[PDB]
Design a protein around this ligand. Sequence first.
Ligand code: OF9
Ligand code: OF9
Ligand code: CL
Ligand code: CL
Ligand code: CL
Ligand code: CL
Lengths: 304, 304
Amino acid sequence: SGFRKMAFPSGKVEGCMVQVTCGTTTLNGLWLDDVVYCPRHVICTSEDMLNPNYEDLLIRKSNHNFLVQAGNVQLRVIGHSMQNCVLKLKVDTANPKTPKYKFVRIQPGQTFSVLACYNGSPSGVYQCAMRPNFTIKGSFLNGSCGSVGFNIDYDCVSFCYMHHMELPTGVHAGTDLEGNFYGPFVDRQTAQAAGTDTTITVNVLAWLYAAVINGDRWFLNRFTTTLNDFNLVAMKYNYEPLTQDHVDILGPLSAQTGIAVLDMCASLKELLQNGMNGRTILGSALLEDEFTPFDVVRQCSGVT
Amino acid sequence: SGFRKMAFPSGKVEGCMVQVTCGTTTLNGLWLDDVVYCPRHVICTSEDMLNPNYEDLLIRKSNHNFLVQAGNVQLRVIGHSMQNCVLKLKVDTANPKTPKYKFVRIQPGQTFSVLACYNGSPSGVYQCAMRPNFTIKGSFLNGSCGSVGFNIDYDCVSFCYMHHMELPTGVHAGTDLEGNFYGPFVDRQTAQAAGTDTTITVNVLAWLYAAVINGDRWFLNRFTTTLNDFNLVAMKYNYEPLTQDHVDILGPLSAQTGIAVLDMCASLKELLQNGMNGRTILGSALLEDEFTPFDVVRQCSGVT
Ligand SMILES: *[C@@](O)(C(=O)NCc1ccccn1)[C@@H](Cc1ccccc1)NC(=O)[C@H]1CC(F)(F)CN1C(=O)C1CCC(F)(F)CC1
Ligand SMILES: *[C@@](O)(C(=O)NCc1ccccn1)[C@@H](Cc1ccccc1)NC(=O)[C@H]1CC(F)(F)CN1C(=O)C1CCC(F)(F)CC1
Ligand SMILES: [Cl-]
Ligand SMILES: [Cl-]
Ligand SMILES: [Cl-]
Ligand SMILES: [Cl-]
């Protein structure tokens, strides 16, 4: 029993993390087979950051401009090319520790593990959700660009996020591993800011199921609601609409607890309308929306 | 910026995790050099669990009774011995991936990362605190015994916890890597239960400093207090006493924020007496006590 924000074991990703230096700019890259993936703004100088022409900047560079370190071992760059906001650096050595992997773009509301890295050396691992406004509430400092987010399934690492920058509210923005940004952000210096966010309803419900499995039942009630009148309450409290597919995904959790989704929706409606009235759920006094139905099943027993 | 419950990268520990089978009982062990460390109750049958004589049970066993699997590779047991509640199984193969390591016992109030494991295969990683009552609020299912907790410092892994069992309130108990239990618990079936717990005051204060560094200042005030009158309030709200050494450890954080510890204590006293009045700190509506002063410094910038 118990419930924690649990990351995937990070070893398969640690053995892919390298340092990339171009000029005085230093940051992290991801080394898979004979390619190092890193944020393209490693080739930028601070002046270039207003409106750089990344294609020009790259033509003016050569292989020996790029310094790639895997621990202490130098890796020699034998090629360079750019895909969207990612630079691809081909190196002389294929990574012997390359895991089975995929580049997958994730959806708002889904979770992933983050390996915070500095100077190519991993620092910490933690769990994140892609917010509905395509930011992540991460934990990142200067030099973390190039750190990646990922999920692991049957020893295959699905990379979904590469870190690029921090927005003024302190939330974080980045790209998938094809270099395409999540959300309406650009890798240059503007006044860009996160749009308005919403709460991930299906995840709050999954979390309530987790609590029932772990013995929190005080928020439960005998009422049931319609999917339409629940959604109508959701709009008032800035919660994402709940779909029939969401109801279907919660199916396994409702089956294990014996509480049908729509009954659980009645509980959520009461918790939004009346607050938590001095009680806590799974050690939190706020409704938690960063656990997917999948995360709950993976961590909770199949019993109770 | 940002603040998350961040674990250490788990790779160095993943490469030490093995499966140990004795009879029908299967659980995890830790493979360092040519020794596999695992909970001694792997030799138990369900009957033996009332009051086993572990020394007798072990004499009646032989090396070929022990099945140790490192992934797919069999490891042959060439010796067995017992230290307190841990069994030490000497195997034919020294672990090539053994990291630099130490066995250290931690103090109540300190944190560590946990690598949840099942059948020798790592499942997840998360951060825990040793509670003042020597339990941990972990996330563990049947088959997690043998999973370890650890900290990493300059590539050296300090193992501090091996998981053994779950207590009736759903909290978790285990030993250090010398097999000595944390807290007044035994590896047998009794009515044992966690004693009463308290909140880790120095960690709450560290966390408030983290929030100030991340821009939460609403809880601040102009008042200062004496260490004696703060401690006197702490007793009323079931908070651990604050020592002058605690004040000294918070020094770096007070220096970076410019808020002296005792002023911060005045803030904590107000937050205990008046609640949080509908506001949140670092995304929590409760005072968080599972970040040490060290954890805050490691994750927060040195600026602001
Ligand atoms: C890198 O972009 C990075 O660490 N980004 C993530 C981040 C930064 C701050 C807080 C949380 N996450 C490095 C790359 C770099 C550039 C120059 C010298 C060394 C490293 N960027 C930074 O550390 C900061 C500081 C800076 F150098 F002034 C520039 N910077 C940025 O984050 C910029 C934001 C906008 C951009 F287009 F993404 C380019 C980088
Ligand atoms: C192991 O002890 C374990 O997983 N402990 C941690 C745990 C259990 C439940 C919830 C959270 N954490 C395995 C060892 C085992 C024993 C027999 C068969 C297979 C594996 N123990 C268990 O999975 C559970 C179920 C059990 F098998 F009935 C016995 N058990 C225990 O946890 C016992 C608690 C008291 C003890 F002295 F520690 C012995 C194990
Ligand atoms: Cl690819
Ligand atoms: Cl499960
Ligand atoms: Cl040792
Ligand atoms: Cl730091």
